[PDB]
Ligand binder design. Structure first.
Ligand SMILES: [Ca+2]
Ligand SMILES: [Ca+2]
Ligand SMILES: [Ca+2]
Ligand SMILES: [Ca+2]
Ligand SMILES: [Ca+2]
Ligand SMILES: [Ca+2]
Ligand SMILES: [Ca+2]
Ligand SMILES: [Ca+2]
Ligand SMILES: [Ca+2]
Ligand SMILES: [Cl-]
Ligand SMILES: [Cl-]
Ligand SMILES: [Cl-]
Ligand SMILES: [Cl-]
Ligand SMILES: [Cl-]
Ligand SMILES: [Cl-]
Ligand SMILES: [Cl-]
Ligand SMILES: [Cl-]
Ligand SMILES: [Cl-]
Lengths: 271, 271, 271
């Protein structure tokens, strides 16, 4: 029980060049382990929404990074599925009691790392959830989807097949990728680099969003970046060059709906 | 041996609010198990082609849905690969005799669920095949492809890397996604929501088809939805807005070939 | 120790219709096994760069193909993860000593096949590496990426999430897909069919390259195929039809940078 956990993590970070899996003190190992435990349980989270703005806790990212530095790789598994890594998986040693307490389903061969929070009534189809991620209640993670490090996934989100939510560990100051409540992310879409998809939005298949992806609002004719406004319906499109010789792909907002519409219209029917 | 299996399933469906993994009768459990067994063996199939139209068997979908309701989640696996789910995997308890009898290959870490049919001479690279799917003879399912629930995959189909074939369990009345014989589906493509790809067609990489995807026939200039006509070669493209400010992505049919051409021209050479 | 390994492989190839897992001689089995061992260790490679041109060793491809013909399928694994295949996985029977000697990390549930070379300081996130692939030092293979058969991946390459590098075993004469040193391949991109991505290039998300993909150089207005010149920054775009009715998707080179720029600019910042 550190006197101040954040301060211990921050001073260990400053001392990180001198930390290894052999030389690290019990004090620092316990502080890091306690932080990862808190992430795993959802008592801590890398980013949270305060005063309607997402805030990042850099000290928690430092703990995650120190947890890599403080552990050696170890042989895991057996038979034709041997592995060699330094991050424990989330469900190692779980039995019925632990899984029942968690309230979620893990469909084989889904894997999550220790230090990811998975809420009740989540379904993990074969998929990957990396350390630091937060997957809130009722969310569906479909087959070969990925929830990257530190990503914040809201309640009742649908991550369709092959969807990737990009991790953001470094830079320390950078907010993680955020999918807010009740979003639908269509198959093969990718949202990376701390893009925020606000609540009730719908991404069609094949939408790729990074900080440099142009988001063209069809109704207004305006280009923006980095954020899908709440309730937006987004599809892949393109914008022409000035001389008409070619176009570059972008995302296009083709309409915007409210929460009532999302409850009374199926995703299939929203287009 | 139910007197009428369909009727038993249909009356259990009507009674489903009163069915759980604790309270369900032997009669209903056996009827559901027999239906899933039939799906697993390919003696039953969720959809089939009759009089040259695909038909759906809603009672079989009801059985699949009841099989979820009637089973508790259970711990599966061990070591760094523990899972917790209520649907058995297809090959649990198989030995050499059972695999040899099936006539297909399962490359690690591919997984299929019980209740999916896999025909002889199929190769499952690392991939997922969900309950209710039917994968016919000679088909190749490449790495990180997905065959979703109830999807019907024809003979000698090539599902390339990262291809997803979307599941359709609900609505009960909806036909599943259909890939007919001898189709080639290029890497990262997605075909969902009961789209039918007719025989001998070729989808390039990155083609995404749902019921709302415009299919533009280049030769005729016409837009259609929901079906790729036999022998079509389909690539990603776009259609411009009336005012020229932007375009929206769509599928484009760039040519149409017959079965003789498909046998004498490689996929690489077809473009 | 064959008198000439290449000649033994080439004569076994000529005799391949008469080779099976029951009838094959010790001489041929040993020659094939020795070739696969050499691939696995990186002492042999399917393609290599000589006089600044990539060359293919057809006899090595013949050995890989013979290794399939000479082995029966075998049950692998246990529990809810049973498999049935004829190619051993790379790490079967490895312990700590073998993994430490290799110098790479294998994050569960990543799998590689025997006969793929993985260099020191590689990280395999959950991903697949097929037989014959060569993955050089410092490369990151991210979640649900695929390195296909015979593909040559350079040093310090970043294969982002869901990236597929297509295999090329047949035709024997065809060069494999090549990703040269220090390339960044953005999420969901696909590079197949022996396309060469030259050193220091950057592919954005969603770039799909085959031999038939038009590569439009924005600065020059010229179309080429099959090769990304060194240092190119490539994004998805499209080219319009002559009559303006539609466009077809293509890759667009939007700038070209030198090695100094790649060291002093983040991938995020390069756009
Ligand atoms: Ca210390
Ligand atoms: Ca573990
Ligand atoms: Ca327990
Ligand atoms: Ca009953
Ligand atoms: Ca099972
Ligand atoms: Ca058996
Ligand atoms: Ca011989
Ligand atoms: Ca093995
Ligand atoms: Ca060892
Ligand atoms: Cl820890
Ligand atoms: Cl915000
Ligand atoms: Cl431009
Ligand atoms: Cl059952
Ligand atoms: Cl039909
Ligand atoms: Cl429009
Ligand atoms: Cl061998
Ligand atoms: Cl070359
Ligand atoms: Cl055209």
């Amino acid at each position: 029980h550190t006197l101040d956990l954040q301060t211990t993590i921050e001073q260990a970070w400053e001392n990180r060049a001198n930390l290894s899996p052999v030389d690290a003190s019990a004090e620092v190992r316990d502080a890091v382990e306690h932080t990862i435990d808190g992430l795993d349980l959802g008592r801590l989270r890398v980013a949270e929404k305060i005063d309607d703005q997402w805030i990042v806790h850099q000290w928690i990212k430092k703990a995650v990074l120190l947890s890599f530095r403080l552990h050696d790789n170890a042989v895991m598994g057996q038979g034709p599925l041997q592995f060699y890594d330094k991050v424990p998986t989330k469900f190692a040693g779980y039995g019925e009691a632990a899984f029942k307490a968690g309230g979620y389903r893990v469909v084989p061969p889904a894997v999550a790392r220790r230090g990811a929070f998975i809420a009740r009534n989540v379904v993990l189809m074969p998929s990957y959830v990396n350390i630091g991620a937060y997957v809130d209640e009722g969310t569906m993670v479909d087959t070969w989807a990925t929830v990257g490090s530190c990503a914040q996934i809201g309640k009742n989100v649908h991550l369709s097949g092959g969807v990737g939510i990009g991790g953001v560990l470094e830079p320390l100051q950078a907010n993680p990728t955020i999918i807010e409540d009740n979003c639908f992310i269509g198959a093969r879409s990718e949202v990376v680099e701390g893009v925020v998809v606000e609540e009730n939005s719908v991404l069609a298949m094949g939408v790729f969003l990074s900080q440099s992806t142009k988001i063209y609002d069809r109704a207004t004719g305006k280009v923006s970046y980095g954020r899908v406004p709440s309730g937006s319906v987004v599809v892949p499109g393109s914008l022409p060059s000035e001389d008409g010789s070619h176009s570059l792909a972008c995302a296009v907002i083709v309409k915007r709906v409210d929460a009532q519409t999302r409850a009374k219209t199926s995703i299939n029917d929203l287009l």
